[PDB]
Design a protein around this ligand. Structure first.
Ligand code: YEW
Length: 384
């Protein structure tokens, strides 16, 4: 019953996890200081030359042409790449191993990898390959050439007919995430990407957490992005948070406000002002007088931007769907991803990156004196 798990791609002990373990053993011991131990050198003698050969046969960063950097995050960047052997175009996310360990979070990527690898959903960016080298994790994803929703809003004045459509796709994308047993926690326009047809997919699942059997999570850390974080996730900081998927619906209200107003509803000059605007949302949420927002739109926004106990969506997404804001002549909840998107991108090339702004232009581990094992947390990341 064990040879199933060697073949199983979700298994901790498949062939590509086993190779990871061999490879990281060689990397965490091959130093002059540690080769004064003869056990260690007895191993490096036997294996160092075949481990270097298989390193050449495994997928590596040098198999790709880097065309452009199109995204950045706390621990790395996203590159537009072309696989040279196959000429296929991809988006490749890099995570710095030094910076994930020097900042003591080295476990978020497991859920990101598994969602994109296995969600098999039209609402989730698909992952094709995960591999690593001694400095970086790599995630090879389908390239989303329509750009993200930040870029769309900066380029257009968004009519309600459009916000209607993008809100609905976000709602459906989040509903699919929830049905996998996950709360997103970092829903925002930077995480919402558009494919060649102008339809949405979610991309940055670094904050995702699996729910209880009650549909709740225990968490004592505020997570996500300051403009979009919900009161209950903010309040959970140091305070035994116990909350459900409806935190994601709060971020949908912030998104819809930003689309129709032009600004986030809790903008402040400082992070702590934003945090205190959010805590005081019953009085700080205020629509600009010159904002010609319909009354269905204002109602849906205020129905999302309240406390969780009365938040639209607390009881399920059917009550979101029937909201009159969503009445329209272009799409149904049943077929929206098969209808014409509001902005279909005009693409000049299979590496057209015109919907992404340019981004401009590292530290490494200290040579160890004893066995530290900096590569052990990344064992099992490789995936084909
Ligand atoms: C803890 N998190 C981090 O350190 C980190 C590191 C790097 C990036 C990010 C956030 N981010 C930003 C842009 C982005 C774009 C694509 C994409 C797919 C197809 N096209 N594009 C442009 C896919 C994923 C991301 C993405 O995750 C976060």
């Amino acid at each position: 019953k064990l040879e199933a798990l060697i073949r199983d791609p979700r298994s901790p002990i498949n062939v590509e996890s086993l190779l990871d373990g061999l490879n990281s053993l060689v990397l965490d011991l091959d130093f002059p200081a540690l080769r004064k131990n003869k056990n260690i050198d007895n191993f490096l003698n036997r294996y160092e030359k075949i481990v270097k050969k298989i390193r050449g046969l495994q997928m590596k960063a040098e198999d790709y042409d880097v065309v452009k950097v199109i995204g950045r995050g706390a621990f790395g960047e996203v590159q537009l790449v072309r696989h040279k052997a196959s000429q296929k175009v991809y988006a490749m996310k890099l995570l710095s191993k030094f910076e994930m360990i020097k900042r003591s979070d080295s476990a978020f990527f497991w859920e990101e990898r598994d969602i994109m690898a296995f969600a098999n959903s039209p609402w989730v960016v698909q992952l094709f390959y995960a591999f690593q080298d001694d400095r970086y994790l790599y995630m090879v994803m389908e390239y989303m050439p329509g750009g993200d929703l930040v870029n769309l809003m900066s380029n257009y004045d968004v009519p309600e007919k459009w916000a209607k459509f993008y809100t609905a796709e976000v709602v459906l994308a989040l509903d699919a995430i929830h049905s996998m047993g996950l709360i997103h926690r970092d829903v925002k326009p930077d995480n919402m990407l558009l494919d060649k047809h102008g339809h949405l997919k979610l991309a940055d699942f670094g904050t995702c957490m699996k729910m209880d059997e009650t549909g709740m999570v225990h968490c004592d850390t505020a997570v996500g992005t300051p403009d979009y974080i919900s009161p209950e996730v903010l309040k959970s900081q140091g305070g035994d948070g116990f909350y459900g998927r409806e935190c994601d619906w709060w971020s949908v209200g912030v998104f819809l406000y930003e689309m129709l107003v032009g600004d986030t509803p809790f903008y402040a000059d400082s992070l702590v002002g934003t945090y205190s605007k959010i805590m005081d949302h019953k009085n700080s949420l205020c629509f600009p007088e010159d904002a010609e927002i319909s009354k269905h739109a204002k109602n849906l926004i205020c129905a999302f931007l309240t406390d969780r106990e009365v938040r639209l969506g607390r009881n399920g997404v059917e009550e979101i769907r029937q909201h009159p804001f969503f009445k329209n002549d272009q799409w149904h909840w049943d077929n929206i991803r098969e209808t014409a998107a509001p902005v279909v991108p005009e693409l000049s090339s299979d590496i057209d990156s015109s919907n992404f702004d340019d981004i401009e232009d590292v530290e490494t581990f200290p040579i160890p004196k004893a066995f530290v094992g900096n590569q052990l947390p990344f064992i099992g990341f490789t995936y084909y």
